[PDB]
């Protein structure tokens, strides 16, 4: 999969989409639909479908929803307030977690300002908490912005 701070973005296009194989697969731990209830998906047509992908903790799946707050929805991935699609989530302990700790899945924990919806930020500048300038080196009130 893809990190949480640089999510992916696939633009599904002209095709025949069968959201029933999704809806009834029973392998998903979370399948919420917001703009439109799930059973009526296989009876509507749009212009574009986008699919974003990433990996988070188990109890941060509550912040992937319109109108939430927290380290994830504030500055990692923000959903607009009139969302239309659906959110799907499933546990993946056996694939992504490895003995000794899988330190390849990072997230951003400091940013100047919360994200605009569907905005993305892969920069790696040293964050500056206090008033003292940082000059690209770590120290008190000068923190690296990514944790794992």
């Amino acid at each position, epitope marked *: 999969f893809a990190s949480v701070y640089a999510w992916n973005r696939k633009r599904i296009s002209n095709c025949v989409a069968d959201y029933s194989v999704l809806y009834n697969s029973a392998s998903f731990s979370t399948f919420k639909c917001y703009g439109v209830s799930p059973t009526k998906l296989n009876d509507l047509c749009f212009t574009n479908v986008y699919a974003d992908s990433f990996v988070i903790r188990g*109890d*941060e799946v*509550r*912040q992937i929803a319109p109108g939430q*707050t*927290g*380290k994830i929805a504030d500055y990692n991935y923000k959903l607009p307030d009139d969302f239309t699609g659906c959110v799907i989530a499933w546990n993946s302990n056996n694939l992504d977690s490895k003995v000794g700790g899988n330190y390849n899945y990072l997230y951003r924990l400091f940013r100047k300002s919360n994200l605009k919806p569907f905005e993305r930020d892969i920069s790696t500048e040293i964050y500056q908490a206090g008033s003292t300038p940082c000059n690209g080196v770590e120290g008190f009130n000068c923190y690296f912005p990514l944790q794992s």
Partner: nanobody
Amino acid sequence: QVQLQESGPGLVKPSETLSLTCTVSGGSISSYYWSWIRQPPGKGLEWIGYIYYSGSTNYNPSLKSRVTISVDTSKKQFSLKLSSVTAADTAVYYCARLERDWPLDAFDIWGQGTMVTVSS
């Protein structure tokens, strides 16, 4: 705003079951985790289980097979019952919240503890 507050007695001899509660003041049950934390005199802290609210649990295997936590969401109580105490558990007992949602973790607003002696 929200504060905690202990309860319950303690003076019972050795080898019994004690009880404590942590009635919530400002009102926030049903959303967080709530745990109990020991501290002997002059020594470092410790930890015991917690209880979500809907579901539940217990923890700290070193103290396992002795401790049971329960929750009454109506009047906002945690019961904690340890059994067959040993006068080595003569300590202060805090009931700090916990924190999720916004990761944070660690703990949060505590509760002034309760000296609980165990002897004759």
